[PDB]
Amino acid sequence: VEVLAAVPLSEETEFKVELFVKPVIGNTTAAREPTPHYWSISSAIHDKESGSSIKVEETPDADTTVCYSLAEIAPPDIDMKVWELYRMETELLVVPLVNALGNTNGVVHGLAGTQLYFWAVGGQPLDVVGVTPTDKYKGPTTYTINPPGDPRTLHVYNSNTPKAKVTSERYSVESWAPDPSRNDNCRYFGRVVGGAATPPVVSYGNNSTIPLLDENGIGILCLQGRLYITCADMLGTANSRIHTPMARFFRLHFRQRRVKN
Amino acid sequence: EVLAAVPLSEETEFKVELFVKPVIGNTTAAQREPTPHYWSISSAIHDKESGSSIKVEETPDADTTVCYSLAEIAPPDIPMKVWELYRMETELLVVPLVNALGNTNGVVHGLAGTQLYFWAVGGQPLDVVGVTPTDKYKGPTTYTINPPGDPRTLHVYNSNTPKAKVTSERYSVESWAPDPSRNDNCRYFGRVVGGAATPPVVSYGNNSTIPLLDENGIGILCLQGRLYITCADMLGTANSRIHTPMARFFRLHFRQRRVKN
Amino acid sequence: EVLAAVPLSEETEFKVELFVKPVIGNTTAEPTPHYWSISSAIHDKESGSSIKVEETPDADTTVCYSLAEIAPPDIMKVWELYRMETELLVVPLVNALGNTNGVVHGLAGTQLYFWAVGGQPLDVVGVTPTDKYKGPTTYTINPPGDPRTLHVYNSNTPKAKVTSERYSVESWAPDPSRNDNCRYFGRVVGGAATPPVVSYGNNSTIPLLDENGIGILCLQGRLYITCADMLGTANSRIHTPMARFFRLHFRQRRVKN
Amino acid sequence: EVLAAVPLSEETEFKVELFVKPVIGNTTAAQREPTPHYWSISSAIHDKESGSSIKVEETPDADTTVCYSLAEIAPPDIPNQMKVWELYRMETELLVVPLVNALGNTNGVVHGLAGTQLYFWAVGGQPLDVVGVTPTDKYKGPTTYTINPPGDPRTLHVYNSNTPKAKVTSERYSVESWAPDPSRNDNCRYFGRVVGGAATPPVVSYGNNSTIPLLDENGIGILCLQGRLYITCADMLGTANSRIHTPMARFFRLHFRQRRVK
Amino acid sequence: VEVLAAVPLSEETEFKVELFVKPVIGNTTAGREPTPHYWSISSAIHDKESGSSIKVEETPDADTTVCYSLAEIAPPDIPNQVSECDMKVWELYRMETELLVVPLVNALGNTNGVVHGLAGTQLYFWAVGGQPLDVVGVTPTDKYKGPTTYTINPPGDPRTLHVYNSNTPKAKVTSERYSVESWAPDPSRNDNCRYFGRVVGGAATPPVVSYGNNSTIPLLDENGIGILCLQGRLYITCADMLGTANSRIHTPMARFFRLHFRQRRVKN
């Protein structure tokens, strides 16, 4: 895989797509592939009944976790030419939450808490690394693909850390992190904010682009004719339910790249 | 489409200053179009008497929501040349709120909470997208144009998400977000801050401009001889009432653009 | 009509340093400003009283814009303010605030940081924060009009020039539609418990040239400084910096006719 | 009377590193120079035993206030000078560790350091020019150790003609009573940040690959006209369990070249 | 010693390594070298039983403190390393470092449906050097001794160590036993070393961590010289603390490094 020069940006050598990627929340019902919930509001987080021996901090309902969202783009068909993602815009679809959250005797409720803002854009699926937040965290007993291994040994990156590729919408954001040792031909960016009551701050607009060229001036190459978008966003909780943007918008700019073959 | 800019001359330039008033929903039914409240302080958010079946978190009073504000500018006739907005300044009209908020045994009350800061500037009305914050949010039963559809399916961007254009001051800021897939010939910018007690931070001054040229050096073109200003700003709540800046100021700079016809 | 700058010479340059004092309203019977950096306590009146403190507070508990004028030496040619430094005079408040059983009290709350510099007084716009806010019954020049109609900028919005130290910062905001030949900058921070953050130093300047390279022109031979700063409250009293420092740099400008 | 810089040479350059200790007031009284406490943790702030007439918000124990720290540097003599030493750049860096276990807990609830903060340094060819101020209409300062601003506290909470001036020539100037004088301090660089609030988290960065240039608009640094450089500084991170905390030290590395003068 | 010119970037003269450095928490159990816990979650901080005399704010369990993590890199041996006039040595000229982190929500539990969060006092620190990190011994309190096992505590009276003075002990981070609450990097030393640290106080302060894969940190000094591996080794030392949750300290799952070496000429 040797990279040559960019093709002169022409009408039939350029390609643009806009798309909205929906947020994903886990599904407790068992089906045939499990179905994602496209929700921007989860079920309530709460300790189970007195008698029950399910510990919600160890095995939460799939209902109350966010998984990475997925989308694939196959640009039109074309000493070899391949599609190159050289820039993009991405923007969050978001409204302020006030009235919908209710009030306690006129004290307005608000959206706040632990947050994630993540996007990834690559010529193959996102390489991910399996982790536990706690010595006792197993994940949901349905829907989610949980990291294989003893939770007591996975709260640190070690030789037994499991690796995986985000090829379905079943990877919980609380259990899998992007693998910085892999993800070649891929740009990603993530921001985690902790705290129980941390206000989320989101900006959006329509006159701002993200360049995607590396140190050599090479963007993402679609070597198998596909671009893999993977992303996840979490704004905090409100009334014990996790909230998400209504969507993550992408506009992708492709040119053509010469590759030796 | 677009040719060269006309040499900046006295006859070929045009400037306007204006203040855009904030909009709050009106509970009284009209006689005639519904009338906006130009208020920077809403009615109190509070639950109904425990007998009542109106759920304020599902159908709030129009009284307690902010809608997008509107203004149109028609620059003077031209004796095809078209008006082009190439830069502007916009500034919030704001004072600190201290004494007016009262106190509790000398404990000074403050303005804080969930915030929005938004402006848009375009050759046509703002393209907007209909959304729900909750699986149960319907919006006010009067005044507001609410997003058509089942609230259970609108909390995520999907094939059923309704589209609209902000052509009246009846679009609640809690239900409609700018459409990033549209809004060509338009620049907008939005910031949303969550939280129930988040302090607002506003800066203002008179020596700062916003350039409005795109990647090609083209500003907003008034193809039908009009510029559409649409904006909304929310600073938080105080004593259960939402506050807004007293106004949003704009100064618009137009030159003339030669256009192939 | 503005011409070229005069070559920077010894007699064509002028510098002044000054401290501008904060202003708090005065309840007693021109009315005299209180030059205080700490106000009276905000509290409701006794139960019997018909005075509503959120509608008509004591002048005692509000900050008004501070004023200073500078007339550079006599010299056609006119004095031009082309740069300045401004800096807040400030100390951390710890012991002075007291404590509740060892829990140290702090300064926090709603803030304003504002300065303006112009060849005429600051153009200001009258506003109400509430449908019911009238302002203090003495000292302050309150915005004329029904409070129910002034919480939004409209036709009834009164205009005024800051020509005395009686303009409450809670009722008057700089007019962005006017204030030609003037730079100003303001920051407002809300919240009841918001920590103030203030930086200061002595190696930082603010340029004051506009898009044309023209600073503030003293067309009537005067420079008008107007400013106000509020750090929050402590024990129900509003605090201010001890002063706002300015150093002004003037050159000469040829103004045609 | 400033001329050109001397060509950077081995003999014409000079570097020093030093740690400046934080200063807290000392209650044990005078007769003789009072002794500073070099502490990064003060005594507890608390009201006196009920019935007492000492008001801690008006006259606190010297124990519970931070004073400006001092250090002087005299670079080596200049074989037949007039050439003078010029501080043209420096690095300064806070010596700091996160406080967790040491702060204790309340039924498993970890205590933290938070509160009102100051971060200040000054570097000059003479002592720091300072201005006397009161935070309150009733604040007198500690009845021992500290040099308190002269005047009625009711008239000192604003800068006016009654504002006393002083030079930081001892480690007895309380940070709560004296602020750098922006109308003076020629041949001096200083920088200060004040953060209010009772529970404000401090944020401190440090590293070893970052310098602060000290040249003014003319390309002139601090000139040691009497052969000395005066370092004055103070840093406060907040409180923990009613005691004020400080960095363990403020580090400086100073870079001198020589400046020719007439 | 006397640094000469960089060797022309070649295939033969370049070297890259990626590695993950594990966080370190103290170990209470006990003969040989004490074993670090590679945990991103500590034991609970709690006072002892009302009948005990161990004061947890003076001598905490090794269990509840973070120590500096260590890693060493020895790049490949150099062909024709020494000549008449000079020798070639490995020079670290840039790196990327990135935290391995996930949001903690469900794992933290809840009280009546009020979701728990990770918050509190934080440290973000990395160091990269041709020798071990020079560190300075300090006390946060006039009474803090540190854990009675595992940790190498600063020698001296705690009453005199809460300030930098002539009694301040110096040390090199040569094992994973230096508690982050007792030892700070020495700015008066650490030549041929770049380090960077951020401390955030407060009991309830939210941590904010960014990560990505298109950002590098240059490591050249004022002269254009990076870290020189004069004894053929690069020493990585680092520590990161995100706050507490349910009385236990949390850490990133790891700190990732990618190191870029070229060759540097040096007069012997």
Alpha-carbon span A162 to D11, nearest angstrom: 61
Contact E56, D104 (CB under 8 A): yes
Close Cβ partners of E52 (under 8 Å, ≥ 6 residues apart)? none
- Calculate the dihedral angle through the C-alpha atoms of C168, C170, C171, C177, rounding to the nearest 10 degrees: 100
Contact A85, A219 (CB under 8 A): yes
Alpha-carbon span B210 to B253, nearest angstrom: 10
Largest Cα–Cα separation, chain A: 71
Instruction: Say how many C-beta atoms besides its own lie within 10 A of residue B58's C-beta.
Output: 15
8 Å CB contact of A177 and E106: no
CA B30 to chain centre: 23
Contact A199, B198 (CB under 8 A): yes
DSSP-derived secondary structure letter, B41? B
Alpha-carbon span B93 to A63, nearest angstrom: 44
8 Å CB contact of D102 and E144: yes
A184 by Cβ neighbours in 10 Å (0-12 / 13-18 / 19+) ranks as: exposed
Q: With the C-alpha atoms ordered E160, E163, E167, E171, is the resulting torsion angle positive or negative?
A: positive
Give the length of chain B.
Answer: 261
Closest-CA residue to A85 (of A259, A260, A261, A251): A251
Alpha-carbon span A69 to A229, nearest angstrom: 8
**Which residue of chain E is at minimal alpha-carbon distance from A46?**
E113
B:C CB pairs within 8 Å: 164
B12 by Cβ neighbours in 10 Å (0-12 / 13-18 / 19+) ranks as: middle
**What H or E segment, with its residue span, contains residue D234?**
strand D229-236
Residues 16-75 of E with CB under 8 A from D: 44-47, 56-58, 60, 64-65
B184 by Cβ neighbours in 10 Å (0-12 / 13-18 / 19+) ranks as: exposed
- Give the closest-approach CA distance of A89 to chain B in angstroms: 10
Q: From residue A260, how far is each of A76, A80, A213, D206 by CA, in Å? A: 21, 6, 19, 47
Name residue C154's amino acid. N
Give the length of chain A.
Answer: 261
- Calculate the dihedral angle through the C-alpha atoms of B219, B225, B227, B228, rounding to the nearest 10 degrees: -130
Label residues B241-259 b or e (16+ Cβ within 10 Å = b).
bbbbbbbbbbbbbbbbbee
Alpha-carbon span E184 to A65, nearest angstrom: 39
Rg (CA), chain E: 21
Instruction: Quote the strand ranges of chain E, DSSP E.
Output: 2-6, 15-21, 24-25, 66-67, 69-73, 87-100, 110-111, 114-115, 122-129, 134-137, 170-172, 183-185, 193-200, 208-212, 217-218, 227-228, 234-241, 243-245, 248-250, 254-267
DSSP-derived secondary structure letter, B136? T
8 Å CB contact of C232 and D196: yes
Beta strands D165-167 and D129-132, pairing class: antiparallel
Which CATH number does A1-261 carry? 2.60.175.10
CATH class of the domain at C1-257: mainly beta
Alpha-carbon span D53 to D62, nearest angstrom: 17
Q: What tokens were used for E154?
A: 């600063």
- The 3-state DSSP class for residue A85 equals strand
> Which of C43, C151, C210 minimises the CB distance to B40?
C151
Name residue E258's amino acid. R
First to last CA, chain C: 7
Q: Chains E/B: 3 or more C-beta pairs closer than 8 A?
A: no
Close Cβ partners of C155 (under 8 Å, ≥ 6 residues apart)? none
Alpha-carbon span E126 to E133, nearest angstrom: 10
Topology of the domain comprising E1-268: Polyomavirus Vp1; Chain A (2.60.175)
State the residue for tokens 């919930």: A37
Contact B236, B111 (CB under 8 A): yes
Alpha-carbon span C39 to C107, nearest angstrom: 13
Q: What tokens were used for B206?
A: 């008179």
B157 by Cβ neighbours in 10 Å (0-12 / 13-18 / 19+) ranks as: buried
- Give the closest-approach CA distance of C53 to chain B in angstroms: 7
Alpha-carbon span A42 to A61, nearest angstrom: 10
Alpha-carbon span A123 to A3, nearest angstrom: 14
HEC per residue, B203-261? EEECCCCEECCCCCCCCEECCCCCEEEEEEEECEEECCEEECCCEEEEEEEEEEEEECC
Q: Which DSSP string corresponds to chain C?
A: -EEEEP---SSS-EEEEEEEPPEE------PPPB--SB-PPP-PPPTT----TTTS--GGG-EE-EEEEE-PPP--EEEEEEEEEEEEE----SGGG-EETTEE---BS-EEEEEEEESSPPEEEE--SSTT----SSSS-PPPS-GGGSSS-STT--EEE--SS--BTTTEEE-TTS-TTEEEEEEEE--SSPPPEEEEESS--EE---TTS--EE-TTS-EEEEEEEE-EEETTEEE--SEEEEEEEEEEEEE--
**What H or E segment, with its residue span, contains residue D106?**
strand D105-106
CA C68 to chain centre: 10
Beta strands B66-67 and B23-24, pairing class: antiparallel
8 Å CB contact of E202 and D206: no
User: Which strands make up the sheet holding D129-132, listed edge to edge?
Assistant: D165-167, D129-132, D178-180
C76 by Cβ neighbours in 10 Å (0-12 / 13-18 / 19+) ranks as: exposed
Contact D234, D20 (CB under 8 A): no
Chain E contact for A144 (CB, 8 A cutoff): no
Instruction: Say how many C-beta atoms besides its own lie within 10 A of residue A98's C-beta.
Output: 32
Alpha-carbon span C154 to C54, nearest angstrom: 23
Q: Where are the domains of chain D?
A: 1-262
Contact D246, D22 (CB under 8 A): yes
- Give the closest-approach CA distance of B238 to chain C in angstroms: 9
8 Å CB contact of A47 and E210: no
**Which residue of chain E is at minimal alpha-carbon distance from A129?**
E100
The pair phi, psi for residue E27, each rounded to 5°, is -115, 125
Closest-CA residue to D20 (of D70, D66, D73): D70
Q: How crowded is the C-beta side of A212, counted as CA atoms within 13 Å?
A: 27
- Give the closest-approach CA distance of B186 to chain C in angstroms: 24
* Residue of C51, C111, C151 to mutate, interface with B, max B Cβ within 10 Å: C151
Rg (CA), chain D: 20
8 Å CB contact of C185 and B204: yes
The pair phi, psi for residue B153, each rounded to 5°, is -110, 0
Contact A254, A15 (CB under 8 A): yes
Alpha-carbon span C153 to D261, nearest angstrom: 61
State the residue for tokens 């006599």: C74
State the residue for tokens 């923007």: A91
Closest-CA residue to B111 (of B26, B234, B194): B234
Closest-CA residue to B125 (of B64, B72, B82): B72
Largest Cα–Cα separation, chain C: 70
Q: Which CATH architecture has domain D1-262?
A: Sandwich (2.60)
8 Å CB contact of B95 and C179: no
- Give the closest-approach CA distance of D79 to chain C in angstroms: 33
> Which of C109, C176, C186 minimises the CB distance to B203?
C186
Name residue C121's amino acid. P
Alpha-carbon span B141 to B132, nearest angstrom: 15
Give the length of chain E.
Answer: 268
Q: With the C-alpha atoms ordered A158, A159, A162, A166, is the resulting torsion angle positive or negative?
A: positive
* Residue of C125, C130, C159 to mutate, interface with B, max B Cβ within 10 Å: C130
Instruction: Say how many C-beta atoms besides its own lie within 10 A of residue B180's C-beta.
Output: 24
User: Which strands make up the sheet holding A186-193, listed edge to edge?
Assistant: A69-73, A227-234, A115-122, A186-193, E208-212
CA A247 to chain centre: 11
Instruction: Quote the strand ranges of A69-199, DSSP E.
Output: 69-73, 81-93, 103-104, 107-108, 115-122, 127-130, 163-165, 176-178, 186-193
- Give the closest-approach CA distance of C100 to chain D in angstroms: 8
Alpha-carbon span E202 to B118, nearest angstrom: 33
**Which residue of chain B is at minimal alpha-carbon distance from C211?**
B207
Contact E167, E161 (CB under 8 A): yes
Alpha-carbon span C182 to C227, nearest angstrom: 13
All residues of chain D having their beta carbon less than 8 Å from the beta carbon of residue C35 are 158, 160
Beta bridge partners of D222: D87
Chain A contact for E113 (CB, 8 A cutoff): yes
Count of H-run helices and E-run strands, chain E: 0, 20
Q: What tokens were used for B208?
A: 């700062």
Instruction: Say how many C-beta atoms besides its own lie within 10 A of residue C79's C-beta.
Output: 27
Closest-CA residue to B201 (of B133, B106, B102, B110): B110
Q: What tokens were used for A170?
A: 């079943």
Alpha-carbon span E62 to E35, nearest angstrom: 11
Phi-psi region of C191 (alpha: psi -120 to 50; beta: other; left: phi over 0): left
All residues of chain E having their beta carbon less than 8 Å from the beta carbon of residue A68 are none
All residues of chain D having their beta carbon less than 8 Å from the beta carbon of residue E47 are 104-105, 107-108
All residues of chain D having their beta carbon less than 8 Å from the beta carbon of residue C197 are 193-196
**Which residue of chain B is at minimal alpha-carbon distance from C62?**
B99
All residues of chain E having their beta carbon less than 8 Å from the beta carbon of residue D197 are none
* Residue of C39, C42, C51 to mutate, interface with B, max B Cβ within 10 Å: C42
CA E10 to chain centre: 32
Alpha-carbon span C223 to A202, nearest angstrom: 42
Name residue D9's amino acid. S
- The 3-state DSSP class for residue A64 equals helix
D135 by Cβ neighbours in 10 Å (0-12 / 13-18 / 19+) ranks as: buried
Closest-CA residue to E176 (of E35, E72, E65): E35
Alpha-carbon span E105 to E115, nearest angstrom: 7
Q: What tokens were used for A71?
A: 């989308």
Q: With the C-alpha atoms ordered E121, E124, E129, E132, is the resulting torsion angle positive or negative?
A: positive
CA B172 to chain centre: 9
Q: What tokens were used for B65?
A: 């929501």
Resolution (in Å) of the shown entry?
2.5
- The 3-state DSSP class for residue E64 equals helix
8 Å CB contact of B178 and A204: yes
Alpha-carbon span B194 to B237, nearest angstrom: 12
8 Å CB contact of B200 and C190: yes
Contact E1, E248 (CB under 8 A): no
Alpha-carbon span E210 to E207, nearest angstrom: 10
Show contacts of A74-77: CB within 8 Å, 24+ apart.
A74/A225, A74/A226, A74/A227, A75/A15, A75/A17, A75/A222, A75/A225, A75/A227, A75/A254, A76/A15, A77/A225
Alpha-carbon span A29 to A203, nearest angstrom: 35
HEC per residue, E231-260? CCCEEEEEEEECEEECCEEECCCEEEEEEE
Angle at E207 (CA atoms; ends E206, E210), nearest 5 degrees: 140
Contact C132, C164 (CB under 8 A): no
Chain A contact for B216 (CB, 8 A cutoff): no
